[PDB]
Structure formats: C-alpha cells, structure tokens
C-alpha cells in the first residue's frame, strides 16, 4: 500500500471516542498511542470499519480496559509492523483486560521488528490457537498469552477451508472472515503478500507485490515519497528505521511535543536515546557516555519524598534530579538492596536532603555514584542537609570508596545519639563545608549520647587454615579493668571479592549478612581463639573480631575491634562431575555432555573417562517369538538487646558484691580404553560396535602434576542402536526336493549382525490360492540352516523370506519358483 495521509503527534485518547476517528485521515501516528477508558461504547455501533490512510503506529499499541469490541478488525485491518524506540510495558501488542473481545482481526500483520505480544486478563478472548506467533513476530520468546478462554478448550474456532494459507485449530486465520497469511520460509525476514509469496530482501511484513519494495509498506529500508528507499538522503533522518524525515521536520516534531520528543541519534530521528547517552545541544544529538550520565528527572512539584521501598521505585533511569528529596523510610527488611537498585545510579541531587524521622538504618551504602549536590533548594536557615530522629545510625558511607562535594548551605546533625562526632568531623572537611570558611549549625550535645566509636585493633597471633576449618588465635586483650572483659565477638562473612566490609549488607532492620560467634575471655597467657564448625573448601571469607566490655554510667567502651581480613579455604579434592549424560547418535559414535564439579577447589587440568565393552545379553538369544543467616536449628544463634542487658546487669551485680565483700574484709590500719579432555565438557567416542553397551565413567582432577587427586567416578551405560544396513537373507535359497516331496531349505543368515535375528518369517503362496506364513525359530533354523517343508502339493509355489533382527523387519526375499511334482 502507501501512506497518503498526514503525520500526527501521539494523542492520549481517554474517556471518549471522538479523537479516535480523527486518526482516520492521518496515515502515520507519530509518537505514543493510548487506547483506554472506553465504557460508554457498545458492540452494536461497529459492523467492520477500516481506514485506508492509517498503516502504522510508531511507539506502542496499547489496549487497556476496552469494552464493546468484538474483534480487532473493526478499527483497521491494515496493521503491518509495530516498531519504534519506545515501548509501553515492553510490549508491542498490549491486550490487557478487554471485554466482549472474541476474535482478533487484521490481515496484514506478519512481522514485528521490535516488541512483544501481551494478552492477559481476558474473559471472552478466543481465536488464539489457530495462528501461531512464530511468523507474525521476529521473536519466539516474547509471547505471553495467559488468562484467556481459549487455553481451557472452551473457545471454538472456525476458519475458511481445512481457504487460509498454512505454509481448536484448523487453519491460520485471525477471524472467521479474515485469513492469516503465513509467509514461506525462504525469506524469513520480509513478510509476504496476501498472494502468499515472500517480499524482496528490502521489504518487511505485508507487501502488495512480491520482489517489489516500491509498493511496500513497513520495510527494513527507509520509506520516502511512496517507496522503500535503502538510504536516507541528508538531511533526511532515519525515522524509526522505516522512513526519512529532514532535520527540519525532526526538530519540529521535537518542539511540538514540548509526547516522546524525537531527537537525532546515529542519523536516525528516534525519540529515545539509549542508555549511556547525553543531549548534545547543537542539534540535540544523543552522544554516547561512559556509565550513567546526566538526564532531567521531573519530580512532582520539584520534590519527591520517600518513606517506603515502593515510593523509591520511581527514581530509576535518573542521573540528575530536578528539585529536592526527603527520606523517611522506616522498618523494612534488607532495605539497602532495593535502595541501591532503585537509586544507586543517582549521581547528583540538585536540592537538599532530609533524614528526618529516619529509621531502620545502621550504615549508609545506598549511594555510590552521588558526587555533587547543587543545592538549589535549601531549608530555611542556609542548610543543605537535615538529619534527625535517628537512634540506630552508626556510620555513614565509606570515605575511600565514595566522594561527595557540596557547594552551599550548612550541615545539620541533631538528635543522633548513636553517631559519634568522629564521622561528623570527617564530613566537616570531606563534605566541603569547612573548606569555605563558614560555620555550620551542628549539635554535639544531642549526638553521641551514651554511645561512642572508640576502638582498637587486634593482632592475630596464629592462624591455621584447612579446607573445612579455619582456626584463629590472637593476643590476649584486656580492658583497663580485667573484670570488664566479657568476651569476644568473632564476625565473619563469605567474601567473593576483596571489597567485603561492614558497609556491605545489613545496615538495616531485619537483615544481616555477617555471622557471629562468641569467645570466652582468656586466662588471667593463653591466646583467645576460635575454630570454625565446617565450611566450603576453596572459598574466601572476610573475618574480624570485636570486644565486649562492661559499660560504665556513660557507656564508654574500652574494647578493641580488629580490621577485616580475607582468608580462603585450602584446596581439596575436586567434586563429582554433575550430570554425566552420554547419547549414542550413531552405531559407531557417542557424544557425552556433563557439568563441571560442584566445587572445583582449584582448576580442572583434565577429565579422565574409562569405558569397556558390554556384550549382548544371553537371554535375548534364547527367547524366540515363533533472615540471611541459618535459622532451621540454633546451637549458637543471633543475639538480641535483652541478652546484652541481662548479661551486663548480672556482671555489674557480681562485681558490686565482690568489691563490697573485699572492702568489708579489708580496711586501712586502725586395560580399559580411555580418553582425556582438557577444559572441555564434551567427549566423542569413535569406532564402537553397533548394538554394544559401554560402561562409561566420568571423573575430574583439580590437580594432576603434583598428585593425581581426582573426584569419584560417576558411571553411565550406553547401548548403541543396532545397524540396519544388511537385514535381508543372504546367500541363495537352496531348495532340495526329495523322493518324499520334502523341500529342504538352505538359506544363509544375514552377514551383518544388526543385533540378533530373533526369527525368520516365511511367506509362500500356492498358485491360485491363499498365501501362508510361517515363523522359523532360531533353534530350528540352526538345526536345518534354513527350514524344511513336509507335504508339498504339485504345482509352482512362490516363497519370500524376511529375516527379523533387532533393527526391525528386513525386506522380503524374492519369490523362488519350484514346481513341486507328485
């Protein structure tokens, strides 16, 4: 066909039906297209309506909550291809919650360059089992058709003939009066005409002539003035990779939407700039970037308050915010994960930040890209940040894996009795608020109350590594008053990378990724230590220790807290190779496929595979037919506040009684074939007998040169199929008639084994009479080296002999002619 109509910007048609028919004259609906909220229409106002001009939708086809529609053939049947740089819920054909819909129309839809087909929450939708979504799209994994009435076998379907092309399901038809033309698989990317031939290598989808892109609509090549043109002559830009529109028209569409404004990218007038691009403001060219780069984010009224994980899923695909933000999230389990996912990419906050009434935070790790705060919004009093009502906050983001710089305002930390002043001083300089010579308003009398961050380090005296246990030891530490020592808290976690610290994982209520063990104080000397309870060999773990002491009336700790170290378990024997699967694909070849060891514990140098011949069974020759921690069991289990409170109260009570007593008591003076494969998960056995079993073993060895330490041998049995090349009876069929009219037979057994010959069927025919079949058992065969007939009548007989091996029936021998005499 052709496009003689106009080009119209996308229209969000909702709650009416007047703007819809406006698209009757328009041939190219540039931009989005939303068809939803129509509950005033009825299924009696349509009888089949088609628009000549409209041939293409360019962003997405959306159908949501549409009533009074019986089929998709009442709007327009000329839809050919749905493509563009924009998508609605990542689908090209959205059919969601439609009612009275019982058929799908169109007769030109055969290819979709980009997109998917969603058909969900339907209640009368039928006609989806006659046409397959394999030659109507360019993807075979982007079809989601669920919750319909034709998936439970309740929808009937009838199509012309048992006609509709084909090269309840009968034919390939959309409706009962509209066939679906499946294109021949000789082109595979250019669709086909209603005639049934595939279009040229420049066309796509429906065409009006085969091998004639001039009359083609919706083509891989570009379209201009009425034909598919391979190239776009400048300034003509590649509009959706289907047409050419001069720079002027491109920027005119862009400005008009100011509806998915169209920009210039790779000479294409596409309205979307892929990930990693930025707006070059000379022609608004999407120029590439490294990592995320600035992009405007239209926050509602220049402000977006977040107080829940759901209220934070709107910050994705955003790099430079427009306005300020507020944080009030409380509770929640493993908040840092969703936080870093939803907004980890935010590099700059244009406005201020608020931590008012924040809860369920122990460490801030939500931001890694944040490096600059513009500060266009400031809380009255020249403040660029607020923090308050935080009594679980222990530390901020790490300062050697992150960078932040402020340009205006004063810091503010009030009512944070758990954040020590050290971090505050750190941020005084790093924040870039004390490098401007301006006094900030920060409270130090309401922060750090009954809390501190004063700690020392521990030195591991000895460490013994094993492949299932890691013993640790360290110097005996003691607080100023030995009695204050309450023990140690060995904290450990599995480190896959050498970047595991207390800032990764946890930091939120309901989740913790650092297992904790406890150690009793040392003798008042022996070095305090701990030995693991078993672990995975060849695994790297992050570990550190912390000290527990009796807190004074001010809760000042004198403990020592070692730094995080990384200890990898020792190499052990390789694990068993998972899933040994050998498949006999011929009579002499077998292909094996397996998975590598469950745990390598090194590097697999080579695999060792043995095999031996398994002869044919004997019975066959004799038988003739003629939260993030473990919580399923606790023997050491996580600690709670009550535990610490109680143990400290009891320690203090004991010490009080002891000092009391002492003061009272003291007052001052008055072989087998094998093969080896290196860094390969497949083996091919060459030269094996047909119909012969083979017991194949499979091992793996993490170390081969120092020692031959390997995994257990997994076994498998493979019975090759029997050959089927020589089943026919060989040698001449010797027929010997004697004085008694006994026609003894001397036929030879097939040369090729082909398994085993369970029997020899004979089919003779008396001239002018009915045939006769006879089964010759192996025993009788060997006894006679053929067979033997007793009682032949005068006249000629036709005899056919078909051997029967394990490769199925052979082929009947030709009729031997012997005129039996009397």
């Amino acid at each position: 066909h052709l496009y003689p109509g106009e080009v119209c910007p996308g229209m969000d048609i909702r709650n009416n039906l007047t703007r819809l028919h406006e698209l009757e004259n328009c041939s190219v609906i540039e931009g989005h297209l939303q068809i939803l909220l129509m509950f005033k229409t009825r299924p009696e106002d349509f009888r089949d309506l088609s628009f000549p001009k409209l041939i293409m939708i360019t962003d997405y086809l959306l159908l949501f909550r549409v009533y009074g529609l019986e089929s998709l053939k009442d709007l327009f049947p000329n839809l050919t291809v749905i493509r563009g740089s924009r998508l609605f819920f990542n689908y090209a054909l959205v059919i969601f919650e439609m009612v009275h819909l019982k058929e799908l129309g169109l007769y030109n839809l055969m290819n979709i360059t980009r997109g998917s087909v969603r058909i969900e929450k339907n209640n009368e939708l039928c006609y989806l089992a006659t046409i397959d979504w394999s030659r109507i799209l360019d993807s075979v994994e982007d079809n989601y058709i669920v919750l319909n009435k034709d998936d439970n076998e309740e929808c009937g379907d009838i199509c012309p003939g048992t006609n509709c092309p084909a090269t309840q399901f009968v034919e390939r038809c959309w409706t009962h009066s509209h066939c679906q033309k499946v294109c021949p698989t000789i082109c595979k990317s250019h669709g086909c005409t209603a005639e049934g031939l595939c279009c040229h290598s420049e066309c796509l989808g429906n065409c009006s002539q085969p091998d004639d892109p001039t009359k083609c609509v919706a083509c891989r090549n570009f379209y201009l003035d009425g034909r598919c043109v391979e190239t776009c002559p400048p300034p003509y830009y590649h509009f959706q990779d289907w047409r050419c529109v001069n720079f002027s028209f491109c920027q005119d569409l862009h400005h008009k939407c100011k509806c998915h404004q169209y920009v210039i990218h790779n000479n294409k007038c596409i309205p979307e700039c892929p990930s990693g691009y930025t707006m070059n403001s000379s022609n608004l060219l999407c120029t590439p970037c490294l990592g995320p780069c600035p992009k405007v984010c239209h926050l509602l009224e220049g402000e977006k308050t977040i107080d829940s994980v759901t209220s934070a899923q709107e910050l994705r695909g955003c790099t430079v915010i427009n306005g300020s933000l507020i944080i009030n999230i409380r509770g929640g389990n493993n908040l840092a994960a969703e936080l870093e996912a939803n907004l980890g990419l935010i590099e700059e906050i244009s406005g201020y930040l608020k931590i008012r009434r924040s809860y369920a935070l122990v460490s801030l790790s939500f931001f890694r890209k944040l490096r600059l705060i513009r500060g266009e919004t400031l809380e009255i009093g020249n403040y660029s940040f607020y923090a308050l009502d935080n009594q679980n906050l222990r530390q901020l983001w790490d300062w050697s894996k992150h960078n932040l710089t402020i340009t205006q305002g004063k810091l503010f930390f009030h009512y944070n009795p758990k954040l020590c002043l050290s971090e505050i001083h750190k941020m005084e300089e790093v924040s870039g608020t004390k490098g401007r010579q301006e006094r900030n308003d920060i409270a130090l009398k309401t922060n750090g109350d009954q809390a501190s961050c004063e700690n020392e380090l521990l030195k591991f005296s000895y460490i013994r590594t094993s492949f299932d246990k890691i013993l640790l030891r360290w110097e005996p530490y003691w607080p100023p008053d030995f009695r204050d020592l309450l023990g140690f808290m060995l904290f450990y976690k599995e480190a896959p990378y050498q970047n595991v610290t207390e800032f990764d994982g946890q930091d939120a209520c309901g989740s913790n990724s650092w297992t904790v063990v406890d150690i009793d104080p040392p003798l008042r000397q022996n070095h305090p230590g701990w030995l693991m309870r078993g672990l995975k060999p060849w695994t790297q773990y992050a570990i550190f220790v912390k000290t527990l002491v009796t807190f004074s009336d001010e809760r000042r700790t004198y403990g020592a807290k070692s730094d995080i170290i990384y200890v990898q378990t020792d190499a052990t024997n390789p694990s068993v190779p998972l899933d040994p699967i050998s498949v006999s694909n011929s009579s002499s070849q077998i292909i094996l496929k397996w998975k590598p060891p469950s745990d390598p514990n090194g590097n697999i140098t080579h695999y060792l595979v043995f095999w031996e011949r398994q002869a044919e069974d004997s019975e066959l020759f004799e038988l003739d037919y003629c939260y993030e921690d473990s919580a399923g069991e606790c023997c050491s289990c996580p600690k709670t506040d009550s535990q610490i409170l109680k143990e400290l109260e009891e320690s203090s009570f004991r010490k009080t009684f002891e000092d009391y007593l002492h003061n009272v008591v003291f007052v001052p003076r008055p072989h087998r074939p094998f093969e080896k494969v290196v860094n390969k998960e497949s083996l091919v056995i060459s030269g094996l007998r047909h119909f012969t079993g083979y017991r194949i073993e499979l091992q793996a060895c993490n170390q081969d040169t120092p020692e031959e330490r390997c995994s257990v041998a997994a076994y498998v049995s493979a019975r090759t199929m029997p050959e089927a090349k020589a089943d026919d009876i060989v040698g001449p069929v010797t027929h010997e008639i004697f004085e008694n009219n006994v026609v003894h037979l001397m036929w030879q057994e097939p040369k090729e084994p082909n398994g085993l010959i369970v029997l020899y069927e004979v089919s003779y025919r008396r001239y002018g009479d009915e045939e006769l079949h006879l089964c010759v058992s192996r025993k009788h065969f060997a006894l006679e080296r053929g067979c033997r007939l007793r009682g032949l009548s005068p006249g000629n007989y036709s005899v056919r002999i078909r051997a029967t091996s394990l490769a199925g029936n052979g082929s009947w021998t030709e009729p031997t002619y012997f005129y039996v005499t009397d």
Binding site: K469, L531, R533, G534
Partner: peptide, 23 residues
C-alpha cells in the same frame, strides 16, 4: 553446625598438633 567423628578428630589435630592428642 556441629563437628563429630572425623571432623572432631581433624579438629583436635588442628588445635593440638604440637603436643599430640588423644581421642
């Protein structure tokens, strides 16, 4: 979880291997 049997022996070794150990 727990160490018993072979694990217990190997552990007694990993902890006491400079003065031997009795199981």
């Amino acid at each position: 979880q727990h160490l018993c049997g072979s694990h217990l022996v190997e552990a007694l070794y990993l902890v006491c291997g400079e003065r031997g150990f009795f199981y």
